Short mmCIF file of C-alpha atoms and ligand atoms in Angstrom, two decimals:
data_model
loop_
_atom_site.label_atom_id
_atom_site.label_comp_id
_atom_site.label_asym_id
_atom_site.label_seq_id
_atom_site.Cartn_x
_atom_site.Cartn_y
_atom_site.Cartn_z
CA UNK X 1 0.00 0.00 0.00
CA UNK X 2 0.75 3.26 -0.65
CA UNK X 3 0.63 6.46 1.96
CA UNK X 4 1.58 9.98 1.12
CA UNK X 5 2.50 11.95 4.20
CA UNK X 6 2.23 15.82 3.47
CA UNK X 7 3.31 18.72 5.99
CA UNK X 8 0.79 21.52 5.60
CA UNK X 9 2.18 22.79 9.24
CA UNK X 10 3.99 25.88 8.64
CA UNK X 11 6.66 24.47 10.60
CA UNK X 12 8.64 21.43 9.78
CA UNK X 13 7.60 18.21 10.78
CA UNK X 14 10.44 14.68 11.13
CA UNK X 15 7.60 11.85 9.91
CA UNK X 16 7.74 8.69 11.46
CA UNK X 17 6.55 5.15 9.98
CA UNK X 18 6.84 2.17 12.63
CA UNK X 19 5.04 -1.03 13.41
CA UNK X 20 6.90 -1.12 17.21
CA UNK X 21 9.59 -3.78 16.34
CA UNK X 22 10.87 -2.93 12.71
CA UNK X 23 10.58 0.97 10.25
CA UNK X 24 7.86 0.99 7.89
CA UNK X 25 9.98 1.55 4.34
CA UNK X 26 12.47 4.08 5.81
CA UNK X 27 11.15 5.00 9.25
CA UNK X 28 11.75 9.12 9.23
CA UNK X 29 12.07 11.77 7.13
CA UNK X 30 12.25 15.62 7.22
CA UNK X 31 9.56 17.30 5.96
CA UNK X 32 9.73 21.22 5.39
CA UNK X 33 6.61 22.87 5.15
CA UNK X 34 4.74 21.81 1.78
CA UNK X 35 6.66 19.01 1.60
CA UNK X 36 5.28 15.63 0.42
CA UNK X 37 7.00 11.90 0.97
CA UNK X 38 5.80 8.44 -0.43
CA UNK X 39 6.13 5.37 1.46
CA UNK X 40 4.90 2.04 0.42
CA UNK X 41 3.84 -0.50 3.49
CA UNK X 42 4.28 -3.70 3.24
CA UNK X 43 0.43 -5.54 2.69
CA UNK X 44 -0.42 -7.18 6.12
CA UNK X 45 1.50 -5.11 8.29
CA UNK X 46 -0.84 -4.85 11.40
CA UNK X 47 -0.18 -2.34 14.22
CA UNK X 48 1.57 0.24 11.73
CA UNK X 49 1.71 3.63 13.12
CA UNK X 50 2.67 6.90 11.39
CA UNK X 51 3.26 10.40 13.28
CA UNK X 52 4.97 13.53 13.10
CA UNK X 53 8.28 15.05 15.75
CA UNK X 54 8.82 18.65 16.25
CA UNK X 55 12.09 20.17 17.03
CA UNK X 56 14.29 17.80 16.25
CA UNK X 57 18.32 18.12 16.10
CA UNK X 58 20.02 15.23 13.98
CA UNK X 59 23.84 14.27 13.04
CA UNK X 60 25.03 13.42 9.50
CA UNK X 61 24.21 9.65 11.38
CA UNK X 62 20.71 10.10 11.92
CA UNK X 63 21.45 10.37 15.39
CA UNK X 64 19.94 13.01 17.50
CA UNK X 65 17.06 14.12 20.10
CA UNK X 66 13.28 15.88 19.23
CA UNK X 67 11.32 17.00 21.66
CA UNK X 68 8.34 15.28 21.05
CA UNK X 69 7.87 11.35 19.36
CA UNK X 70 11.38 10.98 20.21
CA UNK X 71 12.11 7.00 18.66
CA UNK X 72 15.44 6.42 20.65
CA UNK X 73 16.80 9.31 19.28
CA UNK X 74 16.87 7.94 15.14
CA UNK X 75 15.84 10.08 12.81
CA UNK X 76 14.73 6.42 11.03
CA UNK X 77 12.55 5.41 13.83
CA UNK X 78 12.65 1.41 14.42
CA UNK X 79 10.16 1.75 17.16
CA UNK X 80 7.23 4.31 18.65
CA UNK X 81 7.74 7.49 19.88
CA UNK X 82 7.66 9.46 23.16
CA UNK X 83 4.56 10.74 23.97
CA UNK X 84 2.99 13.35 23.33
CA UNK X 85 2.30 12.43 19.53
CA UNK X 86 -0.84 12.61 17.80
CA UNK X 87 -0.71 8.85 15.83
CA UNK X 88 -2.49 7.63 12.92
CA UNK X 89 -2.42 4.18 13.47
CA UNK X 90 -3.94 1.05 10.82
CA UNK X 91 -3.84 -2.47 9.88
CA UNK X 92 -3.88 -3.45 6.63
CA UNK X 93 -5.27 -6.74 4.61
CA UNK X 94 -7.08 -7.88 8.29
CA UNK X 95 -9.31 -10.92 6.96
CA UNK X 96 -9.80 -8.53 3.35
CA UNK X 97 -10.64 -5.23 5.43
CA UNK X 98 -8.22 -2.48 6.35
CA UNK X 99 -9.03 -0.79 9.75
CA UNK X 100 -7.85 2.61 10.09
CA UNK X 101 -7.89 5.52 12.63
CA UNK X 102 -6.37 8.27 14.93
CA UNK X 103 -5.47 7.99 18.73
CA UNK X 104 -5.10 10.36 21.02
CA UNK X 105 -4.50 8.07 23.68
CA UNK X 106 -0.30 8.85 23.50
CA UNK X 107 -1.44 12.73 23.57
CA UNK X 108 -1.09 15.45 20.70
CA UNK X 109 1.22 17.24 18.90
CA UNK X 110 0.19 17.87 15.66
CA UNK X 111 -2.75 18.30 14.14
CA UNK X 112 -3.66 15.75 11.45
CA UNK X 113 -6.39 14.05 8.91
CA UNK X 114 -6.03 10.51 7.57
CA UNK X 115 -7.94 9.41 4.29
CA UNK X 116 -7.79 7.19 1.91
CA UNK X 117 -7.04 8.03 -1.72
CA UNK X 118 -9.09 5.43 -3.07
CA UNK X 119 -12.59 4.66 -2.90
CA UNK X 120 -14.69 2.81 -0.34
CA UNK X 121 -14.41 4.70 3.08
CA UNK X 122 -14.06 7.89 4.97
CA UNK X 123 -11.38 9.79 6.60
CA UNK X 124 -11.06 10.47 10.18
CA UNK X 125 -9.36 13.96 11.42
CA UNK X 126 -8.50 15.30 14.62
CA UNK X 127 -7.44 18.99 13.77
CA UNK X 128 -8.50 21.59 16.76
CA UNK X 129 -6.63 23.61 18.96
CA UNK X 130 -5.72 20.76 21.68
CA UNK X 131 -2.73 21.73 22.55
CA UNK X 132 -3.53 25.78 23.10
CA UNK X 133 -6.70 24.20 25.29
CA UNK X 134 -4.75 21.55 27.15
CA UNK X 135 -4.93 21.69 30.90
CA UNK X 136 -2.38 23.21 32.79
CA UNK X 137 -1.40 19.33 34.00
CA UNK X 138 -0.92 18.00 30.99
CA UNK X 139 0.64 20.32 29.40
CA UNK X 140 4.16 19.19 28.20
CA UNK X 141 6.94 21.67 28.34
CA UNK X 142 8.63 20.34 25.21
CA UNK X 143 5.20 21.35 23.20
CA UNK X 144 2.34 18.88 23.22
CA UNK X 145 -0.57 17.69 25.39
CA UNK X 146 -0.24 14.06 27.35
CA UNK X 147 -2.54 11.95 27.95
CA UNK X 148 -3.13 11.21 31.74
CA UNK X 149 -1.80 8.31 31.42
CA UNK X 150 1.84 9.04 30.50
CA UNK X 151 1.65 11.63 33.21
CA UNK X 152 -0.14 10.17 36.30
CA UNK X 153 0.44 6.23 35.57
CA UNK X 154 -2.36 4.88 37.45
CA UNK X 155 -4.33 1.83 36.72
CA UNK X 156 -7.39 4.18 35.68
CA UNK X 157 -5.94 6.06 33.39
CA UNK X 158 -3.78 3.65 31.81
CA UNK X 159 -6.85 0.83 31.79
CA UNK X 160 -4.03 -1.50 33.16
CA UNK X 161 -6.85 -4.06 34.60
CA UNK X 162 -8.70 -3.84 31.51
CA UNK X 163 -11.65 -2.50 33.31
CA UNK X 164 -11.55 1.74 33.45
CA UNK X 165 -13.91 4.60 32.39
CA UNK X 166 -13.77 8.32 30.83
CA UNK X 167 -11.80 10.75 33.20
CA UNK X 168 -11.97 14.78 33.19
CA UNK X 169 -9.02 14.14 30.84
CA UNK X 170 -10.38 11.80 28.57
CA UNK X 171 -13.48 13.94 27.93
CA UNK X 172 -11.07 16.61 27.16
CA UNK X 173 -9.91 15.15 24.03
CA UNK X 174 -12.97 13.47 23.39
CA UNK X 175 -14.64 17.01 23.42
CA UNK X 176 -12.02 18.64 20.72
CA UNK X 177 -11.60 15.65 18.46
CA UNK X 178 -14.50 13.18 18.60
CA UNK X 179 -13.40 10.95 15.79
CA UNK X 180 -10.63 10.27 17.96
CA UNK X 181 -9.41 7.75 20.28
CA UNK X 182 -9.25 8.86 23.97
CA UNK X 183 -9.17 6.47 26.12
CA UNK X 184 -7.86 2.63 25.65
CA UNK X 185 -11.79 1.48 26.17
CA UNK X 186 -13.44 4.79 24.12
CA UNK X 187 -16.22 3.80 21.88
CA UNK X 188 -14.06 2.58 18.64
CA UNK X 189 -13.42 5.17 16.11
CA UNK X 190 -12.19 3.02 13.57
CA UNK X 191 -12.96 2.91 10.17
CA UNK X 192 -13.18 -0.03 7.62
CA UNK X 193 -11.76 0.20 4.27
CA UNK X 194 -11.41 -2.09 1.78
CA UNK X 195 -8.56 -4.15 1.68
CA UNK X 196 -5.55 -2.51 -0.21
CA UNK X 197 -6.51 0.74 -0.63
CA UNK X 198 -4.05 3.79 -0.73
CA UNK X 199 -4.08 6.85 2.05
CA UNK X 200 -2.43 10.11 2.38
CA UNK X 201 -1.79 11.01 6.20
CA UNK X 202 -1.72 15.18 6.70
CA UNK X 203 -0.10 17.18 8.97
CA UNK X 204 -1.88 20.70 9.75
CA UNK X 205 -4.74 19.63 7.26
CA UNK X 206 -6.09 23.35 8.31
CA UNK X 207 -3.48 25.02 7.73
NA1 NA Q 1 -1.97 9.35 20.70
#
């Protein structure tokens, strides 16, 4: 499959392409503002994930830090990122469907829509102002907005026992960006498309 990732941010973005254990075709790239990259993704793949860093500083090895999605400081990420990240996440070729969405359950960073470029199914966005909005105690200092979980680390917020409900937090994001993940146990968001289709993942779709 293919996925075009575009920065519309007026700020540049370092993509990231992971499935957790292994990089999706390259695993990172700088994008300047505008900029447009094509990755293809192996058909299959389940638990892919694709997000955007900000303010990231990287050697002429690809080594380096960003200050938020951090993957082990690569600028080819082999594995997920430091919350706070905003994450378009999918599985492809799942039994002849493709299931798609967006999660803020690692936080926000960037704003972002994820469609398909083919037909059969809808996009999902999550593009407001979360991280001007975000309470004061989630608020990370590196830019971004956790989610409770990264910052208290109880079993509630984290759904550890499997069993947890919708916190002041949880509503928060659910409130700004209903088509989104908030919560491990939210009401799913995800959508079905039809096996091997084609998406384009954008950053700042407002912009
Ligand atoms: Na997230």
């Amino acid at each position: 499959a293919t996925f075009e990732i575009v920065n519309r941010c007026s700020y540049t973005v370092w993509a990231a392409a992971s499935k957790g254990d292994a990089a999706l075709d390259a695993g990172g790239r700088q994008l300047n503002s505008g900029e447009s990259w094509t990755i293809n993704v192996e058909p299959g793949t389940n638990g892919g994930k694709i997000w955007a860093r900000t303010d990231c500083y990287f050697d002429d090895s690809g080594s380096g830090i960003c200050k938020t999605g951090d993957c082990g400081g690569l600028l080819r990420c082999k594995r997920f990122g430091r919350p706070p990240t905003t994450l378009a996440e999918f599985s492809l070729n799942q039994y002849g469907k493709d299931y798609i969405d967006i999660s803020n359950i690692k936080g926000f960073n960037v704003p972002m829509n994820f469609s398909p470029t083919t037909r059969g199914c809808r996009g999902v966005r999550c593009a407001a102002d979360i991280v001007g909005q975000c309470p004061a105690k989630l608020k990370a200092p590196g830019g971004g907005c956790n989610d409770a979980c990264t910052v208290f680390q109880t079993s509630e917020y984290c759904c550890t026992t499997g069993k947890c409900g919708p916190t002041e937090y949880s509503r928060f994001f659910k409130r700004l960006c209903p088509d989104a993940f908030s919560y491990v146990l939210d009401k799913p968001t995800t959508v079905t498309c039809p096996g091997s289709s084609n998406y384009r993942v954008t950053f700042c779709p407002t912009a």
